[PDB]
Amino acid sequence: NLFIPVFLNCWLAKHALENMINDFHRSAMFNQVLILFCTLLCLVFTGTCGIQHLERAGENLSLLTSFYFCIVTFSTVGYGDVTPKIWPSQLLVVIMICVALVVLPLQFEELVYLWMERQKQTEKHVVLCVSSLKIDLLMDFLNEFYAHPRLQDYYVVILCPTEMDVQVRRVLQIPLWSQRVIYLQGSALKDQDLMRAKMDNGEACFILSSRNEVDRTAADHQTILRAWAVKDFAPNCPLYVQILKPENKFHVKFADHVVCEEECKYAMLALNCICPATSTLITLLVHTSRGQE
Amino acid sequence: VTFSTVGYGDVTPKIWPSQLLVVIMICVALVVLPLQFEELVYLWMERQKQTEKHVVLCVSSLKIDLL
Amino acid sequence: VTFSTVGYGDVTPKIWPSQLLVVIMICVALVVLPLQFEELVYLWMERQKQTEKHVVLCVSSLKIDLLMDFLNEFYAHPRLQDYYVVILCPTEMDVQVRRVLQIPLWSQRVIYLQGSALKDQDLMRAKMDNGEACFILSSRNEVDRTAADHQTILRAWAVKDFAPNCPLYVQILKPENKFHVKFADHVVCEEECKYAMLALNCICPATSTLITLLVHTSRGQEGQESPEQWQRMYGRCSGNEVYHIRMGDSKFFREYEGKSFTYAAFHAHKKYGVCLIGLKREDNKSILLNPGPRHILAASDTCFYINITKEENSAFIFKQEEKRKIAPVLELAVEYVKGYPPNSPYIGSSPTLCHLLPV
Amino acid sequence: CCFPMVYYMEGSVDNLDSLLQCGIIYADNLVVVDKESTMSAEEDYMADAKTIVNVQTMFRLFPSLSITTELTHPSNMRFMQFRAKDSYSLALSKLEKRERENGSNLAFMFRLPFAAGRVFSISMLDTLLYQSFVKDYMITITRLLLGLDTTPGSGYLCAMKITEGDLWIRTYGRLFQKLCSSSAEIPIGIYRTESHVF
Ligand SMILES: COc1cc(-c2noc([C@H](C)NC(=O)c3cc(C(F)(F)F)nn3C)n2)ccn1
Ligand SMILES: COc1cc(-c2noc([C@H](C)NC(=O)c3cc(C(F)(F)F)nn3C)n2)ccn1
Ligand SMILES: COc1cc(-c2noc([C@H](C)NC(=O)c3cc(C(F)(F)F)nn3C)n2)ccn1
Ligand SMILES: [K+]
Ligand SMILES: [K+]
């Protein structure tokens, strides 16, 4: 019947647990905040058992009171209702505080390290697959899409292989577009990026050509491959493809609706030569407006 | 005063379930508020990316000598 | 206890000077410690910029596809489950590579060092001297392929100079540079294999498919749930691999020692379903594909066979065989000139007897 | 210069005039090798876009022609002969997804262009190199099958057509027996053909 400090075995339990997590999941940052919580629990456990047992000689306090004292000094509160009044209980509190103040900042440093490493909804959604998203194109899409009362509940997923532009960020942290527009950095040719955007249950996929690209045939090939990949992944997803050059227009003929830029542009120019301001007529006919301008 | 981690101790629980209540409430605060703080700093990082008679200088690329 | 802002109050200054000293001491601490903290975080910001039996992968630019291919092919073997992979790449880690490497499965198995094989410091950081294998891989994405081949040759030379007793697995793009890394344990030429497989596809259809399914480790469990019979059979037969075992120790071919190679191969296929494609005599170092009927098997030969599973792992089918309890093959046996091409374009081109024009 | 019936002509696979001049009506095979500079796209899987689109154009123009292609990424072999309005080709997508769920490295294998031998990827060479860490003989065996290295007394990969007159050999094992009793040839496998009207 002699005191042997068994309560310190929670440290070994934590050591075994962290040795176990390294191999098996049971989840990247959760695994380490779990070790932080286990370290906190082990610290509180060791502290309360030490204070209670060492103050069995003086103040004759219960384990519940010791636990309450240890947690209220854990938060740096220090009520003073129950306080060690003897030599080694005070010294144990001292070393306990020092031990916590040396161990916990290491866990905090590991947590923020992992946080920095980690830094690098509803149904009826619509996916917009582009190559490089600009502010004007995004605003055009939003204005034309959300001008209809039936598509107010829809939210837009944007699959772009490039990182978000600053102006796109400024428009997307607007509260109106914050929860309606989801920006995924990925490619339609990878199936993982396709299931992240949930193409199989999507309402429509809009493949848009990059008019900014100097080489238009390369952009057309990329749009053809994106349309093919989306059709392969989600065959029952209507496609709205935008094609630059008419030669490549028969490769995406399977799509629900295909618009050729050059064909329409030059036909409208020719009609403007024939019927003046035909382009204005078509522009005002295909733009949703209440006629209040 | 126990919120600020001050702990005057002039008024202090002396019965068991009020003590357990302050214990669980401290734990709940320390587990629920850091989530709000992490959300706030996340939004702060995403956010990181006068008088009359003023004059506007519209340039394409500003250098030190020109300025 | 007042350092940690606890302030128990059991012992508290009760006089003018001690209260003043506590006040000034608190002020001094709160003014002098944040300077140390700011210095510490400054140094932390400037600072931001295992086991034995490991394998080093020396590349020029690492992509997610190449890394996944290497991981799938490497860790598909039960013997290499304890190995961890060191990646020496002179470029910084790509975002997709980061996403795959912070997966818990690959977190502690893949180590990424930003460095070059031509610097010995990066070589000892990767612990090449005790490494099990160094994989020098060519950059197929590079526009200039001769420059990439030169870089791979220099990397192989540097690794050989640093760790001579480290087997090298070099991947060469152009055949002209294939004789500079001939010292390596295993060298694969991209163009040679690619164009030979294309030519054979022109000769024997779907030869490339045969080689692709023969060099890929698979249990043969693909398409076993399919309702189509062709998919089931195709995915079952795609699990075949080329295996080698000593003929004396081979339970497949041991009973056929002293017999002809063709007889042994046919009867092994008839009994167990293994395709004995070739052998290697102990006296020579050359592997012979189908030596022929005049070849007499010996207990010291190394027989190469195609089968779903290894003979060591076919204990289940051997125990099932135990649970079971045309002429016959014999156990023993403008005209074009034929010559080698005159001007071999590069060193290492194997001379092949070909149909040739008279002039 | 010493090889008989080996000619060259300047052109490309994207212009029909060059292929018609080389002769694609009489061409048994059309081997297309991707350009070295085409792999400069930031999106890695988009490096094969030009080759895939050109081969698809030639496949649409000449449906009966046999085109063999080499692709950089194995995930793009689904695009070699793309029939968008085809139920079987899109059920193969579900089959490939199911196989990929089980951790299969050979998820691309069930695609029709790959199974028929139309497309391969050089990633198989990397797989071969990693296999040689365990199977040191694998590279030598592969080169011997391709004829890249010639050791005297070593066989070569040939192919024989099973005609209607040889169907009295009802079984592959009986064919094995006949080959080993007549010409001592060892059959590796079968290139099977089925009717799959689209
Ligand atoms: C203020 O916001 C915080 C503070 C902390 C914290 N980090 O270290 C400490 C002090 C030094 N240590 C203690 O309070 C202490 C003492 C004892 C015992 F007496 F040995 F039992 N056990 N503990 C845990 N607080 C953590 C989270 N949130
Ligand atoms: C030090 O600088 C700080 C600290 C905090 C803080 N975060 O958590 C807590 C403690 C753990 N919890 C408490 O104090 C506490 C207890 C109780 C109650 F008894 F249940 F009513 N209600 N509260 C709020 N402090 C916040 C801001 N600034
Ligand atoms: C809360 O988490 C922390 C807090 C601190 C800290 N920094 O400054 C102080 C206070 C102001 N000062 C004191 O406690 C104090 C008083 C005295 C003395 F009486 F003069 F002897 N000596 N000291 C050290 N706390 C540090 C680390 N972790
Ligand atoms: K296989
Ligand atoms: K196998």
Swiss-Prot record, chain B:
Transmembrane region(s): 15-48
In the record, the effect of residue 37 to A is given as: Reduced the potency of the agonist C23 by 28 fold
The residues that hold K(+) 1 are 6-7
The subcellular localization recorded is: Cell membrane
Q: Which sequence ranges are listed under topological domain Extracellular? A: 13-14
The protein's PTM annotation reads: Phosphorylated by protein kinase C. Phosphorylation of the C-terminal domain increases channel activity.
Tissue note: Highest expression in liver, brain and spinal cord. Lowest expression in skeletal muscle.
The record names the disease as:
Developmental and epileptic encephalopathy 14: A rare epileptic encephalopathy of infancy that combines pharmacoresistant seizures with developmental delay. This severe neurologic disorder is characterized by onset in the first 6 months of life of refractory focal seizures and arrest of psychomotor development. Ictal EEG shows discharges that arise randomly from various areas of both hemispheres and migrate from one brain region to another.
Assembly and interaction partners? Homotetramer; which constitutes the Na(+)-activated K(+) channel. Interacts with KCNT2; these heterodimer channels differ from the homomers in their unitary conductance, kinetic behavior, subcellular localization, and response to activation of protein kinase C. Interacts (via C-terminus) with FMR1; this interaction alters gating properties of KCNT1. Interacts with CRBN via its cytoplasmic C-terminus.
- Known role: Sodium-activated K(+) channel. Acts as an important mediator of neuronal membrane excitability. Contributes to the delayed outward currents. Regulates neuronal bursting in sensory neurons. Contributes to synaptic development and plasticity.
The record's comment about this protein's domains reads: The cytoplasmic gating ring domain of the closed KCNT1 channel harbors multiple K(+) and Zn(2+) sites, which stabilize the channel in the closed conformation. Under low-Na(+) conditions, the abundant cytoplasmic K(+) ions stabilize the gating ring domain in a closed conformation. KCNT1 contains at least two Na(+)-sensitive sites in the RCKs domain where Na(+) binding induces expansion and rotation of the gating ring that opens the inner gate.
What family is this protein classified in? Answer: Belongs to the potassium channel family. Calcium-activated (TC 1.A.1.3) subfamily. KCa4.1/KCNT1 sub-subfamily.
The protein depicted here goes by the name Potassium channel subfamily T member 1
The UniProt gene name for this protein comes to KCNT1
Which part of the full protein is shown? Answer: 291 to 367 of 1230
